Amino acid sequence: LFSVVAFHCPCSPARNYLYGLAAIGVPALVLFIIGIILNNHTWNLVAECQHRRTKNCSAAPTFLLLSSILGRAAVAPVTWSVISLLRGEAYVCALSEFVDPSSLTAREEHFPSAHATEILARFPCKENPDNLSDFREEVSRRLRYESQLFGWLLIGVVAILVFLTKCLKHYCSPLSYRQEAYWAQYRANEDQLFQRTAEVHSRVLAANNVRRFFGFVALNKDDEELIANFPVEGTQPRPQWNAITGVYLYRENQGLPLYSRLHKWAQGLAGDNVEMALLPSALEVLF
Amino acid sequence: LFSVVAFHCPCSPARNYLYGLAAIGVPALVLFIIGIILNNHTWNLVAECQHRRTKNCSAAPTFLLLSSILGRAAVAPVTWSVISLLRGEAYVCALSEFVDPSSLTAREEHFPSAHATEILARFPCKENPDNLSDFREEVSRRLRYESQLFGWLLIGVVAILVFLTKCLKHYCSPLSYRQEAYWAQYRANEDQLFQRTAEVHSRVLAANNVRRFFGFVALNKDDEELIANFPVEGTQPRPQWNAITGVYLYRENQGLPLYSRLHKWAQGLAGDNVEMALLPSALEVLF
Amino acid sequence: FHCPCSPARNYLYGLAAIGVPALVLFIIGIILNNHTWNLVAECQHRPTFLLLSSILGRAAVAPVTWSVISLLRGEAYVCALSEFHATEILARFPCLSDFREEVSRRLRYESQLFGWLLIGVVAILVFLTKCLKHYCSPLSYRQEAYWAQYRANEDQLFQRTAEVHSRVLAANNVRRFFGFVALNKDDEELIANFPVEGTQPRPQWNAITGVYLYRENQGLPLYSRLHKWA
Amino acid sequence: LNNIVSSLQRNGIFINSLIAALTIGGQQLFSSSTFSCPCQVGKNFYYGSAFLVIPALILLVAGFALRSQMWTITGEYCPLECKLACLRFFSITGRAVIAPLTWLAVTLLTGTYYECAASEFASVDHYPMFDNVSASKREEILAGFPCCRSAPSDVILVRDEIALLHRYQSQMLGWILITLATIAALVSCCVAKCCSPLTSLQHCYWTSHLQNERELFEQAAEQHSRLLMMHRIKKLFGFI
Amino acid sequence: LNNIVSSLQRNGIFINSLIAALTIGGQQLFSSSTFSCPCQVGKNFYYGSAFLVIPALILLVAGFALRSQMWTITGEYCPLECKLACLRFFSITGRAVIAPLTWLAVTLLTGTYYECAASEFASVDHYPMFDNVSASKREEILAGFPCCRSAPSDVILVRDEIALLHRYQSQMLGWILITLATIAALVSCCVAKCCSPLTSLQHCYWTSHLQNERELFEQAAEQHSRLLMMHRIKKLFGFIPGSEDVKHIRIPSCQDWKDISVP
Amino acid sequence: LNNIVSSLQRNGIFINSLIAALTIGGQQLFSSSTFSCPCQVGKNFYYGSAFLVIPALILLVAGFALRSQMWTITGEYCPLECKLACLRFFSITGRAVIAPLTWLAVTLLTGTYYECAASEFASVDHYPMFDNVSASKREEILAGFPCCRSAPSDVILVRDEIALLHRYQSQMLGWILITLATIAALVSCCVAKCCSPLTSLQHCYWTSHLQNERELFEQAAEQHSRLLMMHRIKKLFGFIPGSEDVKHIRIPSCQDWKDISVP
Ligand SMILES: CCCCCCCCCCCC(=O)OC[C@H](COP(=O)(O)OCC[N+](C)(C)C)OC(=O)CCCCCCCCCCC
Ligand SMILES: CCCCCCCCCCCC(=O)OC[C@H](COP(=O)(O)OCC[N+](C)(C)C)OC(=O)CCCCCCCCCCC
C-alpha cells in the first residue's frame, strides 16, 4: 500500500536529512537499476566485453552506447525525484534543521535561541509551540519554495537535455532521419519474429524429445499445427548463436545496408578446437 | 494527482516573483519543447544542414521554415500561459512586493511604513492584517486586473498573428489555395502509405532473415499474406534514402508539378567512393 | 467574475472584457470559412462589395451574441459610468448609502439603454439590408439557390476528386521506392479503377480558382470559375 | 410518434401556442432580470414606452425576416396574381403578428411596465397632501416613489391607489386590445373568405399545390446540379 | 395503446373532460398569479365583472372560431339544406361552450371573484354600526375592507359575516347556473331529436361521410398537385423528379426560369 | 393482458366499480376543498340540501345523457317492440343510477353535509340552557355552533350531543337508502326476468347481436362513404386516390370545382 511506502518525517536533528536521502535516493536507485536490467542494449554490451576478451573495440563506440543505456534508464529516477520534490515533504523535512533563525521574519524576535537545532527540526511534525506558529508557517513556505523551484528547474534541464541530445543525435548521425525510422521498424520486427520462432522452435524440439520418451505427445489443437507445419532437425551450433549477439553499428556491404547482426550473419559475412564437450574425443572414447 | 500540479505562492520578498517565473515559465517551456520534437518538419530541416555541410541554401528559404516550425509548436505555451494569467495567482504573487502603498486608495492610510514589502508579500497566503484586509482586497483586485488584462491582450495578439500569417500566406504563395489543399492532401496522405509499406517491407525482410537462422518462420494469420503478396529480395541503398529526406519547395519540371522529394526522386531528377563499409576494398580482402 | 473596482482603471478593464473577446471570436469564425480566402486568390491574381459584406456577416453572428450577452449582465457598463475623492467611492460601490445608490440606479438604466440599441442594429441589418441586396440583383432566388448549391456540391466532389486521385499518384511513388505498396483491400481496386495518365499543371489549377459572377456566353449559364474552365 | 409530431407541426395552431408560451416564459425571466423599474425623475416614460412597444415590434421584424414568402411577394409587387398575393400576405400576417400581442398582453396585465411608464402622468388633484405649489418637488417624488422609494411618510396610501388605479386601467386595455384583435382576426378572416375567388376547398388545393411545388422543384434542382458535377469530374480527371 | 388513445379522441367525452381540466388549471393559475383584489373605492365591481365575464367570452370565441365547420356553414349561408347546416353548426356547439362554462363554474365555486366584485353592493341597513350619516365614508370603507384593509377595530367580525354571506350566495349562483346549463343541454338535444330530418341512422352516416370525404379530398388533391408538378418539372429539366437522370439533361436557358414563375 | 382488460370492460361489474371509485374520490376531494360549511343563520339548510341532492341529479342526468342508445329509445317511443325498448331502457338504467346512489350513500355516511344541512332544525327543549325567551338568539347560536364557532363557554357539550344526534340520523338515512335501493334493484331485475318474452340465454345473444350490428353498420357506413368519395375523385380527376396515378392527369377547369360543391 501507499502507507507502507509513505513518508514519515523524523523530527529530530541531524537525522531527518539522512531519512529524506534514504526515502528518496533508494527508490531512485532501484528505478535506475530496473531501467538497466530490463533494457536489452546493456546485455549485448556485456556480451561484447565477454567474447572479445581483448578489448578490440575502442572507447568511442562504447561511450555512445553507454549513454543510450543510461539515457533511457534515467527516466524513472528523474520522474520520481521530480514528483518527490514537487510534493515538498521530503525537502522541508531534510532542510528544516538548517533554517537560519536570523533569516526568520514575519514575526517579532520571539524565536528561542536555547536549542535552535532541536526546535527547528520538529517543525514538519507540527510539534511547535503556539508562540512559534508564525515562525513554523514561515519555514513551511520558505522551504517548500526551494523544493518546488528545484522541481521545476530539474524538469527544465531534463526537457532541454532531451531536446539537446535528439537535435545533436540527428545532426551527427551519418544516416538520414527517415532511414533510421525504417531501421527502427526493422529491429522491432526482427526481435518480434525472432522471439516468436524461438518459442516455436523450442516447442517442436521439446515435443520431439517427449515423443522419444513416452512414444506420443499430448498436444492441443494449436500445438498440433506447429509440429506439422514447422519441423526441426537439430539445434543451432553455439558459434552461430554467438554471431548474432553483440553490438552493431550500421556496417554496409557493397552499397547495400545491413541493419542487425542477424541480417549481417544471414549474408554470410560473420562466419579444430572443441569446447564444453559432453565426452572426450572419439579416440579417447574407445579406451 | 492534481494537487501536485498546482500553484503555491511563497509569501516572501524578492522570492515570490522567482517562483512565479519558474512555476509558469518552465511549464510553458517544456510544452514548447514537446511540440518541436513531435513535428517532422524540424528533422528534415536539420537533415538539410546535415547533408549539405556547405551552406548551399540561402537565408531566405530557411527564414520562412525556421519561423514556421517554432510558431506551429508554440500553441501549447500560449494555451497554458493564458490559463495562468486568467487565474491571476502567478501575477499577484510575483508583483506583490512591487505594489506601492501610496497608490492604494479607498481607505485611510493604515499601512505601516516599517516593512511595506514584507507585509505586502504575505497577502496572498492569507497572512494579512485584518485592519489591512481592504488593502489586501485592493491589491488582490489590482494585480488580478493586470493579470487578466495582459491575459486578454495575449489572446488578441495570437489571433492577430494567426490572421496575419494565413492572410499573407495565400497572397505570397505562388499556388492557389485549392491546389495547395490538394497538395496538402498529398503530403498528409503519402506519408501514410510510405510508413505502411516500410513496416511491411521490414517484416518481410525480418522474416527472410529469421528463416536463414532457424529454417522456418512463425508468422501470424495476417503475416503469411504479407510474405506471399510482397516478396522482397534486397534493400535500398543509403543514397536512395538521402534523396527523399529534406525540405521541398514546389519544384516544377516541364510544366508537370512535383509535390514531394519522393515524387522528385521517382521521376529520376534526384539521382566510386565507398564509405562506412563493413570490410575494406576487395583488393585488400584478397590479402 | 473578477471586477476590479480600482478608480481610474476599471474603464480599461470594462472595454477589454467585452471588446477583445468579441473580436477574437469574430476571428475564429472567419478562419473557419473558406469563402474569404477565395477573394484573396482573386485579388492577388488581379463591383465586389456585394460579396465582401456577405461573407463578413456570415461569420459575425457569434461575436455579436457574446457582446449582447455581455450587456445582459450589465456589470460592464455600470463600472465605466461609476468611475467617471468620492469618485473612487463610486468605483468602490460594486466591491453614504443614498448618494451611492442614487448613481447606481442610473448606471443600470444607462447600461440597459445601450443593449437594445445593438439589437435594433442587428434587427435592422438582418431585415433591411437582406431585401435590398436581393431585390437589386437580377438573379432570382431559384437562380441563387442553384448558384449556392453548385458551389457547395462541387467542393465536396472536388475533395472526393482530389483524395482518390492523390492516392493513385502517391502509391505510384511508393512503389518506385520499395517495389510494392501496402495498400488495403479498399485501396486494392483504387489503382486499377483509375489509371492516371498525367498530372494537372499549375495554370490548370490557377484557371479554376477565383471569384465568379455569371460571366455567361452563348446562352449557357456559368456559375463558378470552374464552370468557365471547361 | 415522430410522424404524429410532424402532422402537428403542419398545423399552425401549435406554432402559435408554442410561440406564445416561449414569449411568456422569456418575459417573466426578463422582467425580473434587468428591468428594475428605473427611477428616472426626468424622462422615465421613455424606458416604459421602449419596453412596452419595442420588444413586441422586434419580433414582428423577426417574423417577417424569417419567412421567404414575403420575398416573392415584394419582388412581384416592385388582377388574380395581385389578389393571390393578398391572401398569401394574410396567411403570413396571422403568424407574423401573433407574438407581439402575446407580449403586449402579458406585460400590460403584469402592470409593472405601465406603472413605471405613466407614473409621471398621474394626477394629484384627488390628494390634498400633494399640493406642492412650487411645482418642482411634486414631480421629483412622483417619479421617485413607484420605482423603489417606499417613503414611509404617511404618503404610501397614495402609491397603492395609484398602483391599483394603474393596474386596473392596465387590465382593461389588454382585454380590449385582445377583443379588438379577435374581431380584427374575424373580419379579416371574413374578407379572405369572400373576396377570394377560390372556394372553401379550392383554396386548400391551391395552397397544397404551392407547398408541393416548392419542394419538388428544389429537390430536382439539387439533383440537376449534382449530376452536372459528376460529368464535370468525369471530364476533369476521368472518373465518375 | 396509441390506437386506443385515438379511439378515445374520436369520442368527444375525453376531449371535453380534457378541455374542462385545462380550463380549471388555467383558472387556478390565473387566480394564484394575478388577482390582487384591488379596493378602488370608485371602480371595483367592474374589475371582478371583467375577470368573471371576459375570459368566458374569449373562451367562447376561441372555441367557436377554431372549428372550420362553422366557417363552412357561414360560407354556405353567405329546407333540407338549412336543417342540415343548423344541425352541423349545433354539433360542435357543446365542445365550443364547454370551456367557458367550466371557467364560470370554477370561478363561482371559488367565490373570490364574486367577493371582489359584489362587495360594494352589500347591504348596510341591517348593521347599525354602518350608519355613516355622512353618506361618504360608508362607501369608501365598504370598498376598502374586502381587499387588504383588515383594521381590527371591532369591525372585522362584521365584515367577516358579509364575506360569508357573499360566499354562500356565490355558491348558490354557481349551482343554479350549472343546473340551468344542464337543462338547456337536454332541451337542445330534444331539438336535435325533434327538428332533425335524419332518422336514428342517417346522422352518423352523414357525419362520417363529411369527415371521410374531406379527408380523401385533401389527400387526393395533394397527390394530384404533386403529380402535376412532377410532370411540370419533367418538361422543365428534362427528367422526372424522383427518378434517375442519367439519360437526358435539359440545361435550361435564362428565359426558361421565368416560365415557371406564373404561379 | 390488453385482451383480458377488454374482456373485463365487457363485464359490467368492473365498470360499475370504477364509476363508484371515481365518485367516492370526487366526493372526498370536493368535501375537503369546496364545502367550508357556511354559518348563514337565515339560510343554512339550502347549502347542505344543494350539496347533498343537486350533484346526485347532475350525475344521474349525465349517466342517462352520455349513453347514445337513450336518444334512440326516446325516438322509438316518440307489443314486443315496446317490451324490447323498455328492457333496453331498464338495462341502461343500472349504469345511469349506479353513480348518484353511490354519491348519496357516501355523503350520508360521511355525515358532514347532513350536519351542516339540518342544524337549525334541531330541538332545544331537551336542554334548559337554550331558553331564549326572545326567540332570536337561539337560532343564531344554533346555526352558528356547527360550522366553526366552538365557543368553549360550557355549551360545547350540548353542541357535541347535537352533532352526534344528527350524525346518527344521517347514518341511518344512508343505510336505509342503500337498503331501499337494494330491494328496488332486486324486484327491478325480477321484473326484467318476468315481463321479458326472451329467455335467459336469448337476451344475452340478442344484446350481443345489437352491439355487433350497430358497430358493423357504423363501419360499413364509413366504408361506403369512402367508396363513394373515391368514386367521385376517379370521376373528377381521372385517377383513384392513393394509387399510382402516373397514367393520366385531368387538369380540371374552373367550373369543375363547383361540381363537387353540391354536398
Ligand atoms: C512519465 C513520462 C514523463 C515525461 C518525461 C520523460 C520522457 C521520456 C522520453 C524521452 C527520454 C528518452 O528517451 O531520452 C532519450 C535520450 C537518449 O539519448 P542517447 O543516449 O543518444 O540515446 C539515443 C536514443 N535511443 C535510446 C532511442 C537510441 O535521453 C537522454 O539523452 C537524456 C534522458 C533524460 C533523463 C536524463 C538526463 C540527464 C541526467 C539528469 C541531469 C540533471
Ligand atoms: C491546442 C489547440 C487549441 C486551439 C487554439 C489554437 C489553434 C491552433 C491552430 C491555429 C494556430 C496555428 O497553428 O497557427 C500557425 C501559425 C504558424 O505560422 P508560421 O510560423 O508561418 O508557420 C507556417 C504554417 N505551417 C506550419 C502550416 C506551414 O502560427 C503563428 O503564426 C504563430 C503561432 C501563434 C502563437 C505564438 C505567437 C508567437 C509567440 C508569442 C509572441 C508574444
Swiss-Prot record, chains A, B:
Q: Where is this region: Hemichannel docking?
A: 108-115
Q: List the disulfide bonds.
A: C9-C93, C11-C125
Any GO BP: ATP export
Q: Which GO terms describe its molecular function?
A: monoatomic cation channel activity
* Region annotation Intersubunit interaction: where it falls in the sequence: 177-214
Task: Give the main location.
Answer: membrane
Residues assigned to the Extracellular compartment are 7-15, 96-142
Query: What GO CC terms are in its UniProt record?
Result: plasma membrane
Keyword tags: Cell membrane, Disulfide bond, Ion channel, Ion transport, Membrane, Transmembrane, Transmembrane helix, Transport
What residue ranges lie in the Cytoplasmic compartment?
Answer: 40-64, 170-281
Q: What is the effect of changing H201A?
A: Decreases intrasubunit interactions
Give the positions of the site Not N-glycosylated: N131
Indicate the transmembrane segments per the record. Answer: 16-39, 65-95, 143-169
- Name of protein: Calcium homeostasis modulator protein 2
The UniProt family comment states: Belongs to the CALHM family.
Q: Where in the cell is it found?
A: Cell membrane
One Pfam family, please name it. Answer: Ca_hom_mod
Gene name of the record = CALHM2
Per the entry, what modulates this protein's activity? Inhibited by Ca(2+) and ruthenium red in a voltage-dependent way.
Q: Which InterPro entries match?
A: CALHM (IPR029569)
Curated annotation (Swiss-Prot), chain C:
The GO molecular function terms of this record are: monoatomic cation channel activity
> Per the similarity annotation, which family is this?
Belongs to the CALHM family.
Q: What is the lineage of its organism?
A: Eukaryota, Metazoa, Chordata, Craniata, Vertebrata
Q: Name the species this protein comes from.
A: Homo sapiens (Human)
Membrane topology (Extracellular):
1-9
What's this chain's function? Answer: Pore-forming subunit of Ca(2+) homeostasis modulator channels. Mediates ATP release from astrocytes and ATP-induced Ca(2+) influx in microglia thus regulating neuronal ATP and Ca(2+) homeostasis, synaptic transmission and neuroinflammatory response. May form intercellular gap junctions. The gating mechanism remains unknown.
Q: Give the GO cellular component terms, alphabetically.
A: plasma membrane
Name of the encoding gene: CALHM2
**Where in the body, by tissue, does this protein show up?**
Placenta.
Where is this chain primarily localised?
A: membrane
| Membrane topology note | Multi-pass membrane protein
Any one GO biological process: regulation of synaptic plasticity
Q: Which regions span the lipid bilayer?
A: 10-33, 51-81, 107-133
Binding partners and assembly: Homo-undecamer. Two undecameric hemichannels can assemble in a head-to-head manner to form a gap junction.
Which stretches of this protein does UniProt put in the Cytoplasmic compartment?
Answer: 34-50, 134-230
Q: What is the effect of changing F178A?
A: Decreases intrasubunit interactions
Q: Name its cellular compartments.
A: Cell membrane
* Name recorded for this polypeptide: Calcium homeostasis modulator protein 2
**Chain spans, region Intersubunit interaction:** 141-178
Curated annotation (Swiss-Prot), chain D:
Query: Where is the chain membrane-spanning?
Result: 11-33, 45-67, 89-114, 169-192
Gene Ontology MF annotations: monoatomic cation channel activity
Q: Which UniProt keywords apply?
A: Cell membrane, Disulfide bond, Ion channel, Ion transport, Membrane, Transmembrane, Transmembrane helix, Transport
Pull the Cytoplasmic topological domain ranges from the record. Answer: 1-10, 68-88
Subcellular localization, as worded in the UniProt entry: Cell membrane
Q: What GO CC annotations are associated with the protein?
A: plasma membrane
Which cysteine pairs make disulfide bonds?
C37-C116, C39-C147
Q: Which family does it belong to?
A: Belongs to the CALHM family.
What the protein does?
May assemble to form gap junction channel-like structures involved in intercellular communication. Channel gating and ion conductance are likely regulated by membrane lipids rather than by membrane depolarization or extracellular calcium levels.
What does the subunit comment say? Oligomerizes to form decameric and undecameric channels. Two hemichannels can assemble in a tail-to-tail manner to form a gap junction.
- The protein depicted here goes by the name Calcium homeostasis modulator protein 4
Species for this entry: Homo sapiens
Curated annotation (Swiss-Prot), chains E, F:
Q: Which parts of the chain does the record assign to the membrane side Extracellular?
A: 34-44, 115-168
Q: Does the keyword Lipoprotein apply?
A: no
Q: Which residues lie on this side of the membrane: Cytoplasmic?
A: 1-10, 68-88, 193-263
Residues crossing the lipid bilayer are 11-33, 45-67, 89-114, 169-192
User: What keywords appear on the UniProt entry?
Assistant: Cell membrane, Disulfide bond, Ion channel, Ion transport, Membrane, Transmembrane, Transmembrane helix, Transport
UniProt-annotated location(s) = Cell membrane
Tissue distribution: Placenta.
Role according to the record: May assemble to form gap junction channel-like structures involved in intercellular communication. Channel gating and ion conductance are likely regulated by membrane lipids rather than by membrane depolarization or extracellular calcium levels.
Protein name as catalogued: Calcium homeostasis modulator protein 4
Record organism = Homo sapiens (Human)
